[PDB]
Amino acid sequence: FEHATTVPNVPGIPYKALVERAGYAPLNLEITVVSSELTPSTNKEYVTCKFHTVVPSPQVKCCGSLECKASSKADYTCRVFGGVYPFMWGGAQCFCDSENTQLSEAYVEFAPDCTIDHAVALKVHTAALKVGLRIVYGNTTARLDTFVNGVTPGSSRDLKVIAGPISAAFSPFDHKVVIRKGLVYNYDFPEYGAMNPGAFGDIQASSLDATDIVARTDIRLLKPSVKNIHVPYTQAVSGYEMWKNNSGRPLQETAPFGCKIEVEPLRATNCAYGHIPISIDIPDAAFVRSSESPTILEVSCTVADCIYSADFGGSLTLQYKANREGHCPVHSHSTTAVLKEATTHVTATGSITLHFSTSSPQANFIVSLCGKKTTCNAECKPPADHIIGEPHKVDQEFQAAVSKTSWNWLLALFGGASSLIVVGLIVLVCSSMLINTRR
Amino acid sequence: FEHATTVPNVPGIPYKALVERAGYAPLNLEITVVSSELTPSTNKEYVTCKFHTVVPSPQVKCCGSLECKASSKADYTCRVFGGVYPFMWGGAQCFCDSENTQLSEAYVEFAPDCTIDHAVALKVHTAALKVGLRIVYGNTTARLDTFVNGVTPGSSRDLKVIAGPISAAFSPFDHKVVIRKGLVYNYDFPEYGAMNPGAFGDIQASSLDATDIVARTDIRLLKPSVKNIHVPYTQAVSGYEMWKNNSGRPLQETAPFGCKIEVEPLRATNCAYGHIPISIDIPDAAFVRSSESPTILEVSCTVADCIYSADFGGSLTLQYKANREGHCPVHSHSTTAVLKEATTHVTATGSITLHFSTSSPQANFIVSLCGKKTTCNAECKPPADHIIGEPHKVDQEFQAAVSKTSWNWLLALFGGASSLIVVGLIVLVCSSMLINTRR
Please list the helix, strand and coil fractions of chain B in percent, rounded to the nearest 5, in that order: 10, 40, 50
Question: Measured between beta carbons, which residues in chain A are less than 8 angstroms from residue B176?
Answer: none
C-alpha distances out from residue A397 to A274, A337, A368, B2, B298, Å: 15, 11, 21, 64, 88
The SS3 assignment for B273 reads coil
C-alpha distances out from residue B310 to B37, B55, B282, Å: 26, 67, 31
CB contact under 8 A, A125 and B128: no
Give the mutation candidate from A45, A156, A191 for the B interface (greatest B CB count, under 10 A).
Answer: A191
First-to-last alpha carbon distance for chain A, in angstroms, is: 76
Count contacts between A and B (CB, < 8 Å): 42
What is d(CA A382, CA A359) in angstroms, rounded to the nearest whole number? 10
Residue B143 in contact with partner chain A when CB distance is under 8 A:
no
Question: Measured between beta carbons, which residues in chain A are less than 8 angstroms from residue B43?
Answer: 41-43
Experimental method, per PDB record: cryo-EM
Q: Which amino acid, one-letter code, is at B119?
A: A
What is d(CA B370, CA B28) in angstroms, rounded to the nearest whole number? 10
Q: How many CB atoms lie within 10 A of CB B326?
A: 20
Residue in chain B lying closest to A154 (CA): B193
Of B43, B193, B194, the CB nearest to A42: B43
- CA B312, B317, B321, B326 torsion-angle sign: positive
Give the DSSP letter of residue A326: B
∠ CA B393-B262-B208 to the nearest 5 degrees? Answer: 170
Q: How many CB atoms lie within 10 A of CB B38?
A: 24
B276 within 8 A of B164, measured Cβ to Cβ = yes
Residue B87 in contact with partner chain A when CB distance is under 8 A:
no
Q: Which of B378, B297, B387 is nearest to B334 (CA)?
A: B378
Whether residue A172 is preceded by a cis peptide bond, meaning omega within 30 degrees of 0, is no
Q: How many CB atoms lie within 10 A of CB A263?
A: 14
Residue A147 in contact with partner chain B when CB distance is under 8 A:
yes
What is d(CA B160, CA A216) in angstroms, rounded to the nearest whole number? 14
Residue A69 in contact with partner chain B when CB distance is under 8 A:
no
What is d(CA A333, CA A339) in angstroms, rounded to the nearest whole number? 10
What burial letters (b/e) apply to A105-141, b meaning 16+ CB within 10 Å?
Answer: bbbbbbbeebeeebbbbbbbbebbbbbbbebbbbeee
What is d(CA B144, CA B162) in angstroms, rounded to the nearest whole number? 11
Question: Measured between beta carbons, which residues in chain B are less than 8 angstroms from residue A129?
Answer: none
What is d(CA B84, CA B224) in angstroms, rounded to the nearest whole number? 8
Q: How many CB atoms lie within 10 A of CB B228?
A: 11
C-alpha distances out from residue A98 to A60, A84, A89, Å: 13, 8, 20
Q: How many CB atoms lie within 10 A of CB B414?
A: 10
CB contact under 8 A, B147 and A123: no
DSSP secondary structure of A239-265 = HHHHHHHT----GGGT-GGGPEEETTT
CB contact under 8 A, A191 and B157: no
Give the mutation candidate from B37, B72, B192 for the A interface (greatest A CB count, under 10 A).
Answer: B192
Q: Which of A172, A123, A189 is nearest to B123 (CA)?
A: A123
A203 within 8 A of A195, measured Cβ to Cβ = yes
What is d(CA A300, CA A358) in angstroms, rounded to the nearest whole number? 20
A230 within 8 A of A224, measured Cβ to Cβ = yes
**Cβ partners under 8 Å of residue A217, min gap 6:** A51, A53, A75, A108, A197, A202, A203, A235, A236
What is d(CA A125, CA A174) in angstroms, rounded to the nearest whole number? 9
What is d(CA A173, CA A38) in angstroms, rounded to the nearest whole number? 10
Q: Which helix (H) or strand (E) holds A138?
A: none
DSSP secondary structure of B43-109 = EEEEEE-PEEEE-PPPEE-SSS---PPP--SEEEEEEEE-----BSSSS-SSSS-SS--EEEEEEEE
What is d(CA A408, CA A416) in angstroms, rounded to the nearest whole number? 12
C-alpha distances out from residue A151 to A40, A163, B72, B216, Å: 18, 7, 21, 13
C-alpha distances out from residue A118 to A42, A214, A244, Å: 18, 16, 10
Q: Which of B315, B323, B301 is nearest to B373 (CA)?
A: B301
Resolution in units of Å: 4.1
